[PDB]
């Protein structure tokens, strides 16, 4: 469906005027919803963990990739709604959030790149999908060319992504030179015992992981996330993380790797410690993303990581979307718009939000306490599954470090709630304006999922036991 959407959309966006952008985006939003609901029944193919190799052994289809695919569609639906609908109908918000003409096509193509990364069974397909996603994401960074910071960001991103892509291509070709093969499926226990592939496979893993910004190469990505338009940051900080991490989890090429162990430790420490002194909202959220990417990196050191990883990535996607949407909503109550790409920038600008919108702060509290991992919110069960996995496999020191990093990051998670439940002198008296029904309903759905997902935990594990065993 995705290819058909891309083709049609190119035709229409060519033949439509600049005023039709939001209507087009609503059209695609509904189309993706329709695909998600009508084609969901293809799950049935994956009963008993049945795996399918497709396209001449280039693509691999199993329950895991089907789930990642559905999750990516859900994320795309939510993200496209933010562009397809106005928060408010005033002039200010027409200036604040207007979709570019080609933005939707870039979004769909980057989604296609991500899905091809997930399904990749062969290194040529992996490299082509990586380059497709990398190019589309460069352009998404750069499409808002009136922003000085966005253009500077796109250029830095181009160069860092190019270097990491060259590292990846080098790793692929060294694997070819040693094994005369482009598939990991050719690998076996005998082959891993016989030959020392550790260097090559770790170089490939590192080349992929530095593209989502794990320490000690974080800062360039945090700067890019800071300097992009806020509705762009909601996307570019999420989809590449999902695709790359899912590919690495599915491939399992760094089991018990000492280098990945040390880098995951370092990423946890830097993500937790470095986010403490932050005063800008989006830099705080980017360091949050770094710490959570560390939590997921830990899962690359062990076999049978499917359940913990899927649960964690789903709850993280929901929490991330929700926190960005809350920051977006809280824009209507700020008294100073900093600029047209990033209306709110400093955490202190939320001060006293509870007096303007009590339930917005309720939602904020719920999402923050999910991030900290307070039961019975989803975040707690995500961390619980991760701890179960790593302790089952004897990563004791890493478990201690994970404890410590969650503690430390709770400080700058609660910074947001702290300033949000403080008091502001000028308190909204009244307003005729209504927030858009659709986005408020979506934000509410995310909040209710985070709050009451745990009631379905046992049902989920029962389903999982029949589709992934």
């Amino acid at each position: 469906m995705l290819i058909l959407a891309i083709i049609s959309l190119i035709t229409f966006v060519s033949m439509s005027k600049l005023s039709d952008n939001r209507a087009i985006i609503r059209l695609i939003n509904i189309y993706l919803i329709l695909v998600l609901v009508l084609d969901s029944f293809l799950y049935l193919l994956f009963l008993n963990n049945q795996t399918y190799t497709v396209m001449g052994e280039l693509l691999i289809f199993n329950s895991f990739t089907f789930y990642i695919d559905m999750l990516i569609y859900f994320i795309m639906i939510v993200i496209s709604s933010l562009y397809g609908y106005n928060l408010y109908n005033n002039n200010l918000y027409k200036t604040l959030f207007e979709p570019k003409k080609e933005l939707i096509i870039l979004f769909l193509i980057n989604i296609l790149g991500a899905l091809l990364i997930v399904h990749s069974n062969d290194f040529i397909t992996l490299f082509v999908a990586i380059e497709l996603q990398s190019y589309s994401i460069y352009l998404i960074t750069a499409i808002y060319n009136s922003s000085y910071k966005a253009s500077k960001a796109s250029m830095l991103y181009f160069f860092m992504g190019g270097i990491l892509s060259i590292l990846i291509a080098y790793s692929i070709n060294t694997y070819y030179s040693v094994l005369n093969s482009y598939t990991l499926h050719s690998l076996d226990s005998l082959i891993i015992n016989t030959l020392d592939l550790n260097l090559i496979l770790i170089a490939l893993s590192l080349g992929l992981l530095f593209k989502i910004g794990i320490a000690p190469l974080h800062k360039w990505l945090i700067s890019i996330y800071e300097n992009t338009p806020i509705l762009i940051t909601i996307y570019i900080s999420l989809i590449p993380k999902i695709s790359i991490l899912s590919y690495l989890v599915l491939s399992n090429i760094s089991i018990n790797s000492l280098v990945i162990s040390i880098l995951a430790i370092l990423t946890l420490l830097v993500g937790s410690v470095g986010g403490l002194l932050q005063i800008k909202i989006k830099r705080l959220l980017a360091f949050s993303g770094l710490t959570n990417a560390g939590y997921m990196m830990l899962l690359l050191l062990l076999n049978n990581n499917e359940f913990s990883y899927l649960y964690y990535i789903t709850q993280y996607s929901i929490s991330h979307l929700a926190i960005f949407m809350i920051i977006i909503f809280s824009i209507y109550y700020i008294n100073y718009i900093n600029n047209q790409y990033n209306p709110i920038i400093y955490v202190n600008q939320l001060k006293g939000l509870i007096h303007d919108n009590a339930y917005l702060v309720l939602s904020m509290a719920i999402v923050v306490f999910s991030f900290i991992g307070i039961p019975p919110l989803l975040g707690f069960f995500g961390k619980l599954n991760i701890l179960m996995s790593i302790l089952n496999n004897g990563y004791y020191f890493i478990s201690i470090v994970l404890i410590v990093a969650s503690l430390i990051s709770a400080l700058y998670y609660l910074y947001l709630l702290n300033v949000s439940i403080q008091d502001k002198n000028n308190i909204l008296i009244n307003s005729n304006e209504t927030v858009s029904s659709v986005l408020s309903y979506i934000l509410s759905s995310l909040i209710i999922l985070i709050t009451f997902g745990f009631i379905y935990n046992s049902l989920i594990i029962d389903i999982f036991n029949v589709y992934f065993n």
Binding site: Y135, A142, S154, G162, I163, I166, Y176
Partner: protein
Amino acid sequence: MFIGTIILVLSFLGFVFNRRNIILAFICLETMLLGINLILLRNSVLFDDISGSLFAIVIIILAGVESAIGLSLLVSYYRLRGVINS
């Protein structure tokens, strides 16, 4: 393996220790891709295998589109500032 490796490493060091210009940066990217491809093609020949050359062709095409997009990004960056002081 020798010419490609040295082009890769020298272009990488040119990229990293660039403190002269951004064009040097573009060029180091392109030449790195060159060296990768030369290593690949020598291996293809030594194995009498077509997969190496197929991936070489794909690299060629992707380096083309990457150059196109990168130069477009540079132009859009220039449009706002009028000058590249590197």
